[model samples]
Target: TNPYQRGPDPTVSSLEATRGPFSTSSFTVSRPSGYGAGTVYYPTNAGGKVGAIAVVPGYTARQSSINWWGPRLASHGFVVITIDTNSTLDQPSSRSSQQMAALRQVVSLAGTSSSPIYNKVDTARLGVMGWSMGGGGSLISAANNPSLRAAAPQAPWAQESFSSVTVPTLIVSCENDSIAPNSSHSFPFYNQMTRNKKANLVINGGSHSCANSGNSDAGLIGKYGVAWMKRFMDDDTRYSKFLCGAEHQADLSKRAVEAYKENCPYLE
Candidate 1:
């Protein structure tokens, strides 16, 4: 079995109690009979072509807690959906079957049937983002699941050998992460992709938990992830300038801010 089982094992990070103007409530879309699988929705008011993001939370995370950038991304014109892979905190291991089921639900929503809830979404422009173990899952998930056009993994758990995945992956790693090592997750995965792939490792960093929380660097990381999503979704070639180039390789601190500005300049 894949070592990247789904569960919430990481330390609980702070939650943003105050909802932004664009934050949406979590709702159940559909639960197929006997599958024990229920799809939860995090609809945001960020309006546009509706680039959908399928998010996989880290280990030991609650569905409600998985969202730090859901509303923010929605506000940025993305229809964000966070998948609840665990039935409970004690048994959070996500199954390959469940993961694939979730993917099918996402595709159905954006399918041509016009009867799916996600039909309004541009299925052709979909991106996947996950954290820690979820990041590793995204690595394998993107490979097995062809619908994913782009992938972003946050400090992916590298306890296993999923290095040969050939997807357009953007690895967002922290300079000092305890749960997920940068050398293991960032370097090895970046080296392995060798295809349409890029990575950004942030220095002066926080723990794996802090990277996903609304910490100072969280928004900065989200900027790159969102930009990458936009790149594949709209076929915008300009986003590549920030991800690929010597300028991005300069001092990590300035680059973090610069990357944030490049993706969402108005925020700076």
Candidate 2:
């Protein structure tokens, strides 16, 4: 019933699968701006234009920290640009600017026929994602840009409140991250995000790296991340089952999930 739905009906196994049905590819950006180095991932043919998302690595980290998301998400019918900040030491606020800059570039690339991702993106649909300080910046990005369709920040750390955010946000929190512990960083961000569609997905026994990538609970994390983006960015209600229904409760019931909190029955 949805014009934006790309793949066949999804299942837990498929959602957590290493890749989706769409064949995908990637390219390095030689001359990146606003952000530092970046890699763009896209489907060779997803049938129609798909949403684009920008992913940022945390402090002292590079693009590979979150690179797992690039092809995983792209294969599911979205353009993912994973980037490094201008400086690895940059703070969340600066990371915010870099994340949006990366998104802006991808949208711009869609307009040029010479680019690999040209004509592949649905420019109107955009999202942001990040890890640690970068994840903190993702919240700031969402708060600063209400037009953004969605956000998925992992182990985020920031110094500000995000009560102004209107974007549908899925925060992936590490249960035992001393770097950006949930008590001071992630929980409060989720607390303030009550103004919009949001979810706080805490990973059991998770560390900063655990929630970011190459973690044991990656299956659970990726499933929720993709479901959140697809539901909000593409307005694909088909994915709502994975986010708000019995299947969702089943996810919450998993030992891998420490806690799952959200405002259900999200607006369509």
Candidate 3:
């Protein structure tokens, strides 16, 4: 049985509750091996080892841009790390390297006695997420590290081809993004991902940072983000319904949703 699948259905309303069943704790990593500083968020009462996810922010952005995902994912049975880049101007490839380094350090921390996450992480099941340039980096990280379980990039920006990415991916796009326009960035990336389990969600009338820092569509974005990670990273079949069933389509019928395209088949 999947541990994260325990509460009521993981709907926007359900997941929006004050806090999840598990208590959460956080720690700061001033300097992790080959990466910059980061904050680790974990479920202190998780019954067993859980998967970990590393999130990076866009260029000229700080952890606060995507930090909401930390508690949002951690409370639902994941150890989430939100990291800062060594340089605010680092490109996608550089960001990719740092993201991987961050994950590696988290895996290493799982074996360190002084860390609260010691023995709490199932390092084999790892995922990555980010915003804009960081989002592009998340995709690059997935291409560079094929073993990655899943990835979710928001309004990503990259000039490289990610057609070789084999990891499951969810590209969150902002319909009205002026920074990394969906037509040029998100759409092309999703179209090129021919060999992976992928999905592209375009938020209606959203801006470049719509998915970050508690935007109005958080109910929808948060629900889908958590579902994607849980479904692929945890390989929890219980979450398949949320991704592939009619409910997903029905939810998207709302006026707030511009469009959603996916290649997921019902997984039993």
Candidate 1 local lDDT, 154-205, one digit each (tens) = 7777455544555567777776687787776666776666445555545455
lDDT of 3 by residue, 138-185 (tens): 999999999999999999999988899999999999988999988789
Q: How many residue pairs clash in each candidate?
A: 13, 0, 0
**What is the TM-score of each predicted model, taking all chains together?**
0.70, 0.98, 0.95
Error of 1 at 22 (Å): 8.5
Off by over 4 Å in 3: 1-12, 16-18, 266-268
Preferred candidate (TM-score higher): 1 or 3: 3
Q: Candidate 1 versus the native: TM-score?
A: 0.70
Q: What is the C-alpha local distance difference test score of candidate 1?
A: 0.55
User: 1 or 3: which has the higher lDDT?
Assistant: 3
Off by over 4 Å in 2: none
Q: Ten consecutive residues with minimal summed lDDT in candidate 3?
A: 3-12
The residue-level lDDT of candidate 1 at 237 comes to: 52
Q: How many backbone clashes are present in model 3? A: 0
The C-alpha local distance difference test score for the whole of candidate 2 amounts to 0.89
Summing lDDT over every window of 10 consecutive residues in candidate 1, give the lowest-scoring window: 3-12
By TM-score, the best candidate is: 2
Task: Indicate whether candidate 1 or candidate 2 has the larger TM-score.
Answer: 2
